[PDB]
Amino acid sequence: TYKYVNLREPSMDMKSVTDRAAQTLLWTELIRGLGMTLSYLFREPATINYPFEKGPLSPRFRGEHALRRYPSGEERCIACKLCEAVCPAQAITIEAEPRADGSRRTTRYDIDMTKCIYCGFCQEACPVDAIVEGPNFEFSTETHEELLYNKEKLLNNGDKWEAEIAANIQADYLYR
Amino acid sequence: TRPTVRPRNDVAHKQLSAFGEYVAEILPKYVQQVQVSCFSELEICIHPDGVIPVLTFLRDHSNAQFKSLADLTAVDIPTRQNRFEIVYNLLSLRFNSRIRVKTYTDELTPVESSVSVYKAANWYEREIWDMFGVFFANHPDLRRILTDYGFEGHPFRKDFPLSGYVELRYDDEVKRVVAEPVELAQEFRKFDLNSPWEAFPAYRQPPE
Amino acid sequence: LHHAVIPHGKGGRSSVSGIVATVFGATGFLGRYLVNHLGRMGSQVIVPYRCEPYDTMHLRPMGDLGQIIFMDWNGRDKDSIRRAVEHSNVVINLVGREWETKNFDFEDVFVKIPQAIAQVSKEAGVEKFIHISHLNADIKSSSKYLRNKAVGEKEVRETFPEATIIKPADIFGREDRFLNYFANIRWFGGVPLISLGKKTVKQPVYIVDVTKGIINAIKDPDARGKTFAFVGPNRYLLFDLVQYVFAVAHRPFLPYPMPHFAYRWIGRLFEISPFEPWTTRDKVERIHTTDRTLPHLPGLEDLGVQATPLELKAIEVLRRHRTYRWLSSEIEDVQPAKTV
Amino acid sequence: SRGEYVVAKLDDLINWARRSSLWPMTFGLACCAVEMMHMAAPRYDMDRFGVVFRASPRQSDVMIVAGTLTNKMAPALRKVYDQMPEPRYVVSMGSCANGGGYYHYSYSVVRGCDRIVPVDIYVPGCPPTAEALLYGILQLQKKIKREKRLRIWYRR
Amino acid sequence: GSDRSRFLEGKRAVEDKNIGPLVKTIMTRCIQCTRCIRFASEIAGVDDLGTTGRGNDMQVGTYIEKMFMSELSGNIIDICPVGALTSKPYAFTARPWETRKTESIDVMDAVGSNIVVSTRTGEVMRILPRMHEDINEEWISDKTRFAYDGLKRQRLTEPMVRNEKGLLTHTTWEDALSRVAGMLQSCQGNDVAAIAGGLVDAEALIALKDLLNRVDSDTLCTEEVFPTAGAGTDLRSNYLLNTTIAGVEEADVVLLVGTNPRFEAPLFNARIRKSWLHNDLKVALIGSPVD
Amino acid sequence: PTVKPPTARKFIWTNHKFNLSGTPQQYVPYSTTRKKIQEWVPPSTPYK
Amino acid sequence: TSVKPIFSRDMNEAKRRVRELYRAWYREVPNTVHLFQLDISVKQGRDKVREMFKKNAHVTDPRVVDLLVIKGKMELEETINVWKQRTHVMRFFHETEAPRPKDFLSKFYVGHDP
Amino acid sequence: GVRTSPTGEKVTHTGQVYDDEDYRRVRFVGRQKEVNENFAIDLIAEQPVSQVGSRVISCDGGGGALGHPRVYINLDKETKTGTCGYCGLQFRQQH
Amino acid sequence: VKQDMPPVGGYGPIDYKRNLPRRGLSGYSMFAVGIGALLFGYW
Amino acid sequence: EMVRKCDPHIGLLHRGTEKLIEYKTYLQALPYFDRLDYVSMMCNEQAYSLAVEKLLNIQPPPRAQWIRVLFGEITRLLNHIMAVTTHALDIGAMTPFFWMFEEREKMFEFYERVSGARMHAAYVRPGGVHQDLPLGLMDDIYEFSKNFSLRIDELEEMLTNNRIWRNRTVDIGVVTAEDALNYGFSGVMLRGSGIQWDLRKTQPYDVYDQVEFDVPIGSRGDCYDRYLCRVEEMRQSIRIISQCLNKMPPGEIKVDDAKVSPPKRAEMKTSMESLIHHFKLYTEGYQVPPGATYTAIEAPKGEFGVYLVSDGSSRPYRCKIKAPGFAHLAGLDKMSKGHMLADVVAIIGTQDIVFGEVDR
Amino acid sequence: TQLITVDEKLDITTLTGVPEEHIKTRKARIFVPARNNMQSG
Ligand SMILES: CCCCCCCCCCCCCCCCCC(=O)OC[C@H](COP(=O)(O)OCCN)OC(=O)CCCCCCCCCCCCCCCCC
Ligand SMILES: NC(=O)C1=CN([C@@H]2O[C@H](COP(=O)(O)OP(=O)(O)OC[C@H]3O[C@@H](n4cnc5c(N)ncnc54)[C@H](OP(=O)(O)O)[C@@H]3O)[C@@H](O)[C@H]2O)C=CC1
Ligand code: SF4
Ligand code: SF4
Ligand code: SF4
Ligand code: SF4
Ligand code: SF4
Ligand SMILES: [K+]
Numbered sequence A: 001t002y003k004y005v006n007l008r009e010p011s012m013d014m015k016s017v018t019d020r021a022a023q024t025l026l027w028t029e030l031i032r033g034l035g036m037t038l039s040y041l042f043r044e045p046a047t048i049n050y051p052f053e054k055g056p057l058s059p060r061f062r063g064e065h066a067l068r069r070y071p072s073g074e075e076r077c078i079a080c081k082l083c084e085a086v087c088p089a090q091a092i093t094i095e096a097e098p099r100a101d102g103s104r105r106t107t108r109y110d111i112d113m114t115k116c117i118y119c120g121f122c123q124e125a126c127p128v129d130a131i132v133e134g135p136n137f138e139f140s141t142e143t144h145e146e147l148l149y150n151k152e153k154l155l156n157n158g159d160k161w162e163a164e165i166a167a168n169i170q171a172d173y174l175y176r
Numbered sequence B: 001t002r003p004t005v006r007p008r009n010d011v012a013h014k015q016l017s018a019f020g021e022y023v024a025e026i027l028p029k030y031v032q033q034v035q036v037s038c039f040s041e042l043e044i045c046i047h048p049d050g051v052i053p054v055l056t057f058l059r060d061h062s063n064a065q066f067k068s069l070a071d072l073t074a075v076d077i078p079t080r081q082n083r084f085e086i087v088y089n090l091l092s093l094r095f096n097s098r099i100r101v102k103t104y105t106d107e108l109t110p111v112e113s114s115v116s117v118y119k120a121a122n123w124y125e126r127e128i129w130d131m132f133g134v135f136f137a138n139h140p141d142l143r144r145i146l147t148d149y150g151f152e153g154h155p156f157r158k159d160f161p162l163s164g165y166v167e168l169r170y171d172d173e174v175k176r177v178v179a180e181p182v183e184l185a186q187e188f189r190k191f192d193l194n195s196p197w198e199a200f201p202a203y204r205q206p207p208e
Numbered sequence C: 001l002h003h004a005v006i007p008h009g010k011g012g013r014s015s016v017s018g019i020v021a022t023v024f025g026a027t028g029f030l031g032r033y034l035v036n037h038l039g040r041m042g043s044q045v046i047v048p049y050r051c052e053p054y055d056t057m058h059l060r061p062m063g064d065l066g067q068i069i070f071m072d073w074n075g076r077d078k079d080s081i082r083r084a085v086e087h088s089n090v091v092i093n094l095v096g097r098e099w100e101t102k103n104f105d106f107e108d109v110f111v112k113i114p115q116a117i118a119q120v121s122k123e124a125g126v127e128k129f130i131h132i133s134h135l136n137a138d139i140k141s142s143s144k145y146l147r148n149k150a151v152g153e154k155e156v157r158e159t160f161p162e163a164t165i166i167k168p169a170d171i172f173g174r175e176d177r178f179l180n181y182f183a184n185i186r187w188f189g190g191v192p193l194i195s196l197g198k199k200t201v202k203q204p205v206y207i208v209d210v211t212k213g214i215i216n217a218i219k220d221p222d223a224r225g226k227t228f229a230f231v232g233p234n235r236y237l238l239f240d241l242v243q244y245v246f247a248v249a250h251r252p253f254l255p256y257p258m259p260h261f262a263y264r265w266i267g268r269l270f271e272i273s274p275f276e277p278w279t280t281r282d283k284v285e286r287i288h289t290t291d292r293t294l295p296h297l298p299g300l301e302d303l304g305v306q307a308t309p310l311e312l313k314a315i316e317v318l319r320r321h322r323t324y325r326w327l328s329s330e331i332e333d334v335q336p337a338k339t340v
Numbered sequence D: 001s002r003g004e005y006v007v008a009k010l011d012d013l014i015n016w017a018r019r020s021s022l023w024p025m026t027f028g029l030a031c032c033a034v035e036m037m038h039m040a041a042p043r044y045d046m047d048r049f050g051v052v053f054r055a056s057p058r059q060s061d062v063m064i065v066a067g068t069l070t071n072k073m074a075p076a077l078r079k080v081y082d083q084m085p086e087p088r089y090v091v092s093m094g095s096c097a098n099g100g101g102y103y104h105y106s107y108s109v110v111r112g113c114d115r116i117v118p119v120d121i122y123v124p125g126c127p128p129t130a131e132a133l134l135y136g137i138l139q140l141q142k143k144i145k146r147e148k149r150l151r152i153w154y155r156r
Numbered sequence E: 001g002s003d004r005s006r007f008l009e010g011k012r013a014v015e016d017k018n019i020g021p022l023v024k025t026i027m028t029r030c031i032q033c034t035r036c037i038r039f040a041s042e043i044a045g046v047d048d049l050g051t052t053g054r055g056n057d058m059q060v061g062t063y064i065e066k067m068f069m070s071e072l073s074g075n076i077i078d079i080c081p082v083g084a085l086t087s088k089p090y091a092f093t094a095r096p097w098e099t100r101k102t103e104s105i106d107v108m109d110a111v112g113s114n115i116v117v118s119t120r121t122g123e124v125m126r127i128l129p130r131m132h133e134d135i136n137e138e139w140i141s142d143k144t145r146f147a148y149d150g151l152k153r154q155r156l157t158e159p160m161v162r163n164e165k166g167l168l169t170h171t172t173w174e175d176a177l178s179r180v181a182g183m184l185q186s187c188q189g190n191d192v193a194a195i196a197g198g199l200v201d202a203e204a205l206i207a208l209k210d211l212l213n214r215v216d217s218d219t220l221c222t223e224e225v226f227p228t229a230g231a232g233t234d235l236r237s238n239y240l241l242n243t244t245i246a247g248v249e250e251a252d253v254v255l256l257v258g259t260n261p262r263f264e265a266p267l268f269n270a271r272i273r274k275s276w277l278h279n280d281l282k283v284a285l286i287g288s289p290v291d
Numbered sequence F: 001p002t003v004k005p006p007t008a009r010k011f012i013w014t015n016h017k018f019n020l021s022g023t024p025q026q027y028v029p030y031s032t033t034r035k036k037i038q039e040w041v042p043p044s045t046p047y048k
Numbered sequence G: 001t002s003v004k005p006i007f008s009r010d011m012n013e014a015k016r017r018v019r020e021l022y023r024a025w026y027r028e029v030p031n032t033v034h035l036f037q038l039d040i041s042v043k044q045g046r047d048k049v050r051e052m053f054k055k056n057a058h059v060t061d062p063r064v065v066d067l068l069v070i071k072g073k074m075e076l077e078e079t080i081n082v083w084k085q086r087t088h089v090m091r092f093f094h095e096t097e098a099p100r101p102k103d104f105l106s107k108f109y110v111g112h113d114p
Numbered sequence H: 001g002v003r004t005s006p007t008g009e010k011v012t013h014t015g016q017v018y019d020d021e022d023y024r025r026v027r028f029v030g031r032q033k034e035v036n037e038n039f040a041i042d043l044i045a046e047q048p049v050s051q052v053g054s055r056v057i058s059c060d061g062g063g064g065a066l067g068h069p070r071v072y073i074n075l076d077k078e079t080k081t082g083t084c085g086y087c088g089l090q091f092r093q094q095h
Numbered sequence I: 001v002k003q004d005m006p007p008v009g010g011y012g013p014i015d016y017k018r019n020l021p022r023r024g025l026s027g028y029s030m031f032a033v034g035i036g037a038l039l040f041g042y043w
Numbered sequence J: 001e002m003v004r005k006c007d008p009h010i011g012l013l014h015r016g017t018e019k020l021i022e023y024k025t026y027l028q029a030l031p032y033f034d035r036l037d038y039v040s041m042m043c044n045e046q047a048y049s050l051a052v053e054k055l056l057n058i059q060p061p062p063r064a065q066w067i068r069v070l071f072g073e074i075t076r077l078l079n080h081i082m083a084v085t086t087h088a089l090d091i092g093a094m095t096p097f098f099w100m101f102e103e104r105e106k107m108f109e110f111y112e113r114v115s116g117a118r119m120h121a122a123y124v125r126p127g128g129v130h131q132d133l134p135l136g137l138m139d140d141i142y143e144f145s146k147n148f149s150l151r152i153d154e155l156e157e158m159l160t161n162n163r164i165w166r167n168r169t170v171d172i173g174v175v176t177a178e179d180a181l182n183y184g185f186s187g188v189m190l191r192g193s194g195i196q197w198d199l200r201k202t203q204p205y206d207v208y209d210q211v212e213f214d215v216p217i218g219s220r221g222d223c224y225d226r227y228l229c230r231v232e233e234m235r236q237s238i239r240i241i242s243q244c245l246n247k248m249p250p251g252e253i254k255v256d257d258a259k260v261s262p263p264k265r266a267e268m269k270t271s272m273e274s275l276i277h278h279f280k281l282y283t284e285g286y287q288v289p290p291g292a293t294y295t296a297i298e299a300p301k302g303e304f305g306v307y308l309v310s311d312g313s314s315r316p317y318r319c320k321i322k323a324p325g326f327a328h329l330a331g332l333d334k335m336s337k338g339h340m341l342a343d344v345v346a347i348i349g350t351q352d353i354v355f356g357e358v359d360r
Numbered sequence K: 001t002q003l004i005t006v007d008e009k010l011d012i013t014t015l016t017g018v019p020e021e022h023i024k025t026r027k028a029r030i031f032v033p034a035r036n037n038m039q040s041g
């Protein structure tokens, strides 16, 4: 159930000794290595053409966060603070009060995108699928505070990417 | 109890109880308690004067043969007067087993270094100097190994806070990365999560 | 006072200072250390920049998030100034050019732009304005710099009646043009002077002292409308000053007199390039101008600043110019220069 | 004017020369070094963009701070950045280098590498994928493309 | 309990009520434990909560549109083990794991109820009682529970002085303390005096007493006019509740003269009622015939 | 989406925007909550 | 009250070890100013070392001053071997920190600190 | 349903807009205050009241496992409709 | 149930060993080629 | 150039992991372990999962254990590609680096399909695994393992027979067996030095006593025998992936003790007890019985161990992390004596040192 | 004898690395935590 790597006693007959001396003088394994390199010279390379092509992904991908909505216009977030409770980086800050129709909604929903570790506990802790971690990963910014999303940027990302996040959750929610 | 509950290994429990009685009745000078956990692991709680004479037994004895030092660990507990709980974990490759040797100290009592028995601890208890402040006499290069060079204090003591007492920022005045008192932009929000209902009745502590 | 501008915290980086500063000319030498010293109190600093944004990059590590706001501005543009200073409560003016260019003379930089900034800061409701003039600025000087800067001094004083005018005497530092000018005439031919430079008297003031003076001028309500004269504690001749410069850097030193026959013409001999000028005739007329003594004005003693002299920081400045053979030297090797 | 067009084309040439052959330095710290090596790997392939490693800080342009910035390597990072010739750029890769990350409240973590060096392009993630890092590098090229160095010099 | 369900039917939906602007009532969540009724009958003594219905439709309600307004009517927010009775000012605003529980003292009445101000990120969220056997057993009045949001309106924040017109405007502490001490240094005798309020601790009172003893001014007064005739305040036994609050549980006859202890000191009335209930106390009230 | 079109809503954007960094359309963070402590405003009448 | 010592039996040998550590730092300070090419003087450095020694001047516990000797030897070994940098030596000279309030009136003015 | 302050700044659905003398509008000078313009309280008013004929109605937000957890609403109040606790929809017993 | 499972007949066997094809001539053949090249060059 | 003293100063990446674990609950403190050894993510998840499940006195379902072993061997392929290719990169052969990172890119696509993120999955949780395999994943894992053995073959064609490689690894850092046991070496550092020890064979965890594989044992204890041991562990990992894809059992992927693993979101929105358990697992978390375990597994670097002390509450009281690279980098001081500057780089290559878990 | 006599006050304020500002201006509070009246445990 175990094997001995490098426990080969080489043969000491004049045929194999002449073969190893020919390997030493005439460099057989060097030509073998150069031949393997030459065999990779004549292949199709695996360089995809970004940004006109895109790297392959899955519908489970963890990218930019967003707050979704029902198919009636109402925002899903009912201010229940599970997403900031299970947040391992404590990137989420939630401050809530009843709004003008008495419904339990947030007033501050901040996800610090530089504390956030993109592990997706908030998309699985949210009982109403309000916060989701959508498809976008090309949201690099030139300044640090543009990576401190408030509620407004997350609702705008939800309105931006809803046409994709709805199909991804539609394809994926049977596993969850 | 068939799908989800862990299968109990009574063989390991009986063999570790026999070997715990063995190590107890050989060394009554240093071995204080011998316990076997419910998940079949052995713990030999000893006195800090027996760091070398216990381990040198377990490194050498023909029915111990714990040749490997897997992990040396200190656990700080503030409510005890001997607050540091230094934990030796030993692996015997021939007897296919592990033992745990648990000693104790406060901040000022030195614990004897075990580099003469296992050289592997040459960093580990050295780390216990850096992370806890437990001094290990007769150690060759005992100095800090994980913290920064200008770090005053010992981090993994539980009276040391989560964020430190200094932060580093670059400063263009003196053209230098300097240390200033920390002011967190967001406070570390501590969550009082301990539910007041008794989760495990078999671990109940009897009252005063 | 407004609830967001109430000073909080222990005065560190993430504290709130109660200071909203608009630092014009912040991408130079004084604005560098001024944004550095304001950002460690947590002051919301508006930085108007004219240059490339890359040249402003070294201002970004000087504060917390959102405590430095960069924005474009032009000097002949009232709209940019009113767009930049309307939310502040102190406007510091550090706009200066040691040399005139094709698009800006000294009249644009010292008379037009400070009067525009002070006029807008009056007519937009700013409580504190701070202007920076030179100590030798006079109406009838032989240099264009000091004449235009004294005229701009009088204009800023008369159009904003509480403008804290500050007179630093001669500032030395790391990115200066005072010790870096005296040390970077070494391989040109022998440090030219007039009558061996023993005829003009200076007192150099240190830049951290000037910056702490600007901070204490922002803090002090008693410092409204004054005309401060920031000077160093020790007065020097120019000759033994340049002795001390070439004696800290451990350099050869053979000065020579270059008279007024041809040492104003080495300007038009030595700025034939249109680039950043090494010398000019205004630099010649200002280095060979003595520092006037104005004891009646309040100085660094009258804002709670201990003035740090030359000898404790000249090694920090001029370690850059030693070749290799005395980089492992000390401050206890060079004898300090003679005061006057 | 005419010379305005001359310095405009000169800015176009030198900004193209600087954004077309950015040379990153071999600087990784943590998990993001693996994904930066994936951004060098034959799928996403930085080297097609003229983006090739030089280990010396003297001969590099962009410093991808890929990992976590502790206290013990803050002056090392500052001296490495100071030993890069101007123009030099900084891409902050990953959440720990951006704003403290998963170890933001720790006792020995510098909360973001913008406290130490000036940072141009923040690439968020934990780790950002090699495609996202490549997006940050191409956004850095779009940032270098709209520089106006000689135009501002002619207009100063 | 078990970790999953066997129920596959349609649940019940119990109608909400309206019992006041303090106790938000969502009766779907009730479990019919009847702590409402036992509290409102035995301790609060109001007798306005009951069970209407028989079987699974047994609704803990009032059967009328009555507004349950007692002096202790918020304490059903404490002892309801489910979320059927919530605190309407505290409703939707916080969540208990993040609350920093800081132990403190009520000042709204003279009972001095041991409380916990539980906060969140440096802002007061709610006020709970502490279980303390001699004072406030585990109850508080409604003023104690719901007066935290008067603590965040119309607050004084900055020093304010009269300008040349006679209007109060903001100023620093140097200017304000200079303009107070410049008048203070020109006073002596009874030319300076002090009125104390209702919510001021002993440290500030003794600080201002020593300050006016630097001037030799003994005229320092309170809002509440206690008679200084006789022993006055000299012996302590003529202005205290000399027995205890717990000593009400040892008495048999309690005389109340001119007071309304329901509203002046509500948990003292709750202790009087507990002695009335369990000890068969006799109470006589010389004063107005109040409920 | 030419074969399986996405499901339409009233709130999804009719104009997808690219990354708006560096432009005047760049995101600015701010507090989305109102003022907590109501400060006392003095009556502006004379006090006699 | 009978506990195991570290290196010193009583206060006399502990004072001897503190004294030899101060000897080592007094010898060390000119080398630290020289090879790190600092901007400080030997007078200023030795007065700061005097301040660092007098910061712990209230201890009569022999084990505590033994551990202070050992940690001073660690600082010394991190200074002789160039393991500290310029910044780790200049962290003792708190130069970038603003001057903190000391009296009652300024601490009253700036915040709620006792 | 966004309205505009007298200062010149948009109003969120929370109700936050800065003062005229608050300095923190200077972060919006030269940039834009990214607010949402699909207000949820104005989009939930366009939903008609669902006329149902039961006494206890079961609302789950639609979709089955993609909505909120399924709750039960009593509808015996005829003056007030039965508002769902999560989704903001509302029902009515038609008799 | 519909779940990620292996197919009906399982999977095919997977090679996990070394395969170095033993190419090239013998030693005598390589020295014969080299010495013949020497002799032709010399002639 | 003859090196007389190697002092490896560490702590340049010490980010205080095992103090931050003491303030965060068990689900919250899982993704720290992905970030310790950042090429052996799910193996560290598996070690912490076995520690928490040993304290909780529960066990995973069978399908979750087979998924853990399958992705543990995919992670072993990741770590040994990283080890071989960076040990060749630190010498100068930078070509099989670029060859094998296409295969490692495909395995990160497998992680991106099975969990969503490419490196730090947060997948292997205490109670089994978090999410069941997507449809069509095992077909791609079979189509990957059908092609990866040729990649191992051509890598061994390049570097094993090459004399320039053998001159850099034959007599470099010989480790004697008794001093290997003395210095706390574990895993490959033992097995290259002739010591027969593999924690999947001797102290077996979840289903390694059902899959059949071989243990590569060296003969001289140099860099070269450990190179051959890593190549052969890639061979045996292909063997174990074949045996796991042929023997994947149906069923669930979490433990059905719903007080430990969260319920399905389909029944979280339908049942009451499932919503209460979802709420209290994602806000408080689950309580753990009080006690101290040291669960140690065979990460591809060696013994990766968690000494977890649980006070009874839903947060760990102590979580000590034993890394293999810590004791290996301790043994660096003996291993580099008698060699030069260009051999210390090869010794740091043959001990696969990821400093995130060396520093914690 | 290997045991020394220490009758001095057991003080480690110079060994925990804590600055002086967080020793002589901080008020530690030892208390049994009161029961949350929402709950019965
Ligand atoms: C009086 C009249 C003259 C005035 C002074 C003129 C001085 C020289 C000017 C040279 C050209 C300057 C303009 C440079 C390009 C400006 C336009 C531009 O932005 O083009 C971009 C385009 C590539 O676009 P990009 O975004 O990089 O592509 C991403 C992939 N889609 O880029 C391209 O398609 C290629 C750009 C090539 C640039 C020209 C070729 C290099 C320069 C050769 C001459 C100078 C060389 C001197 C000697 C060097 C050593 C041989
Ligand atoms: N000799 C001295 O050092 C002393 C100087 N002062 C005064 O203090 C001030 C600061 O001095 P210092 O830091 O040394 O000078 P600098 O040359 O170092 O910096 C001046 C700054 O002003 C800006 N500026 C100047 N003119 C214009 C313009 N027309 N349009 C836009 N920006 C402009 C420059 O920006 P950009 O790069 O975009 O042009 C630069 O950032 C000056 O006003 C100076 O006269 C006072 C006493 C002594
Ligand atoms: S992905 Fe993780 S770290 Fe990020 S906000 Fe969600 S729970 Fe927090
Ligand atoms: S995002 Fe979800 S989990 Fe977070 S508070 Fe809103 S509804 Fe609750
Ligand atoms: S941001 Fe996260 S994943 Fe990235 S290097 Fe840091 S710890 Fe690793
Ligand atoms: S106390 Fe709560 S659970 Fe009990 S009867 Fe009242 S509403 Fe129902
Ligand atoms: S938190 Fe308690 S009262 Fe509220 S819905 Fe859940 S079980 Fe019912
Ligand atoms: K309740």
Ligand SMILES: [Zn+2]
Binding pocket: H059, H060, H061, H068, H084, H085, H086, H087, H088, H089
């Ligand atoms: Zn609903």
